[PDB]
Symmetry: D2
């Protein structure tokens, strides 16, 4: 609760769950945080009543617009004098069918632009103010889709999460010279909002589907667990951690259980 | 012998080093091949070397244009009746500096569009034509930059080669259901690079430093070595390999020699 | 054709499925081969099928005995003058239960000694003989257990197949200096398994469930598919690949289908 | 400093640097710790004066002896009633030459026995008392040698660190069912003791060699940074993290700088 005492953090995304929860945690740990997103949050009680107005502020920002990200960073340096942490948490899903036969061309271009170019911009403007200080920790939200595939997970989304892992690795290698660390976090399904499926598109129901399919029983992956991983990478107790893909999946991707199972019941 | 007898192959980037030599090898193995590239008179110049018009042909194709890739695939089916192999061989380098501070937004979007959206289109149109036949092998050219970073290797090139591996992985998982294989090849420095454009350094000079920095001594990585790996993945000798990133780097990426070198060799 | 003409190969585990079929393929490609296994009358029974005594021979060899592996290698050099290829194909399964609570200390030591120390010895004696000639290709049989876990796959088998990949990686890094390549192959379930020994389930039954659980449909993984990958790594068509874990699993390990399956297919 | 309040932890190794430092941190965070090793520490002021006798105790234990590890765990359950954390920190180096031509057979067997079988035993007895509670976090010390090779890093040591990663993955997949998490930490060179090289075998000098060769400048990797990573994985702020190889190398393994450098000065 002083783990991040007087550190200045920018969190993009913010009106989504992981961004909101990580902002709450960072404030609890003593940081000053600037929340950014285009949606201009849910209402007010997300960014402004995560913490009090002296520790948290909101900025409208479309991460695919260089002028918006430039303004986000420069506003923050104007307000707080420095930037210690950049948490790039913008990731969108495909709007078109899974199946290469139906997957959309414009949709491929839209998700690449948001998920990869937006991450590039956030990192570029974070590096612009961190490189002169020779201090910084940049964290990207990736996914287990940064190294695995999945039925129903679109080809664009797993190509863009592999690309965010690529930017983490590439930026880690350039920015280590200035003492800046670059890492990413790769979650399994995080509890809520709800998320669609024309079946039981209900958060409690997909949480029990996620637990049923999980390696690591007796717990559910939540936004607070992802926020904990981001606070570890963001602060000074990970000062020699860089280029790490911190997978938070309870071991889900350590196995494909298909053949043990199609041996057990599946006969 | 004639390992690829009767097979029909499309090779994009056919005017380049890997494209031309892989086309030469596939014709030697008894395949019918359709070369495609945007360098139209330049690429049919290349086709007019390899073989006669009944086994090899050239069509102009900009891989970021859905209409050109549709054309390319529909013409191959019209000419030859089937598509057994799609070798997605288009990748471009960044044309702005390595540093994230000088890297450049429009260059980032262009290399992303060619390297990843262009690869998605080629694979999409190959799948459209291959899934009815329940047979096919799709090979992408990736790079050791699909899983490592490098000083002087742009952040967008590393992001897009990670994304190509992402596409290989997610397409392998969808298309296995139809008996179609999807793999990629990840080379180290292939033979040449010719950098007279910048300050000095020619082909044989880069060849010498690449061997000096190589793990595997006594040989150079050639376009013919990459063609051989593509031929393996493309034919019948790899009938159960899919989702493989076939690294052809002589073991270069298996170590970072910097600390061994720092505890000296001999001054 | 005769891809391996004049090459001399040693194949350990030659009485097993992969060993015998790889020996058959290497003879077809024009190689001289020396099969080795502890099943002495049983393995020369196998050699007496493949070819005539001038191109194939059998020597008894316990790979955990330095004196036997020295014998094997020195006999091949005495007979044929050189060693071009060493195919390290010995791996055993645990003979105690999967659960860490029932797993068994002496079984852990035995599988470790055969699977890893046995692989080190084979590679050590191959290097002794290959490094003077500055030529050679060493291939180890690993498993998809060299990078994933599985329910019912013992902890010692997974540890030793990870260790075989470790040996491939560190040997590749030492031996590249002498122009020698070191790679491994990592298969999914090869054709059979025959479990009448435990409660039920035969060969064609395991074959059916392996295909049912497979990513790549319409074909089964065969010993001939693994032999083909070994032949690729063993010959001249892979002259710049070293340190490669050549996964032959039809894309099985590229996804964990449990959560896609949990958000149902159709009940 | 209450992050681990009333958690019971066993740390093996202990008289080495990482074990001592992690024990100090765990006590600072409110845990009760049992230190184990054969050497019976440096004197007394390591295990007994890390913390006070009410929070820390020492137990002689050779991890290759099942009776010793059985006694370590059962002593701990007798003293504190439960086991929350097992930190397996025993790893020995090769005693014989790097170079497959000179690397020792008995030395290969000794390091495998300590590094892999010892880890198996520690995990086996930790699982025996954790599985009934359906609670637990097991952390192994691995190395960047669990996935990379290095000139001068022995083949046994990188085969055993790959095997500890294999045990982490395999145990993670079995023990997730009981709610137990299994992870490992993979460091670059950690500052001290001193460590030999017939050159400047001095800690300050190898620390500046390590920094010279590092990605991530301006800091040195220390035992306190490794201890921080272990405390993250050990406590409840990583409750959905399992099967993770937490690399702590400042990005060192994200690149092989040989060819950029043999381009820069090396001409």
């Amino acid at each position: 609760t002083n783990r991040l005492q007087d550190k200045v953090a920018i969190i993009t995304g913010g009106a989504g769950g992981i961004g909101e929860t990580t902002a709450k945690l960072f404030v609890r740990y003593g940081a000053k945080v600037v929340i950014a997103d285009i949606a201009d949050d849910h209402g007010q009680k997300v960014c402004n009543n995560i913490g009090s107005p002296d520790v948290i502020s909101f900025v409208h920002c479309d991460v695919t617009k260089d002028e918006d990200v430039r303004n986000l960073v420069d506003t923050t340096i104007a307000k707080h004098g420095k930037l210690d942490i950049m948490f790039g948490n913008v990731g969108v899903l495909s709007t078109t069918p899974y199946s290469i036969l139906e997957a959309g061309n414009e949709d491929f271009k839209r998700v690449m632009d948001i998920n990869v170019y937006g991450a590039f911009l956030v990192a570029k403007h974070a590096a612009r103010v961190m490189i002169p200080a020779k201090k910084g920790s940049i964290v990207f939200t990736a996914s287990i889709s940064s190294f695995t595939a999945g039925e129903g997970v679109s080809h664009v989304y797993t190509a863009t999460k592999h690309a965010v892992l690529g930017l983490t690795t590439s930026l880690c290698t350039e920015l280590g010279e200035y003492g800046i660390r670059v890492n990413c976090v790769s979650p399994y399904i995080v509890a809520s909002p709800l998320l669609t499926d024309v079946f039981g598109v209900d958060s409690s129901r997909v949480e029990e589907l996620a637990h049923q399919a999980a390696n690591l029983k007796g717990t559910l992956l939540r936004a607070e667990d992802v926020a904990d991983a981001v606070a570890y990478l963001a602060g000074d107790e990970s000062k020699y951690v860089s280029g790490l893909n911190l997978v938070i999946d309870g071991g889900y991707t350590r196995t494909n259980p298909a053949f043990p199972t199609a041996l057990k019941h599946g006969l």
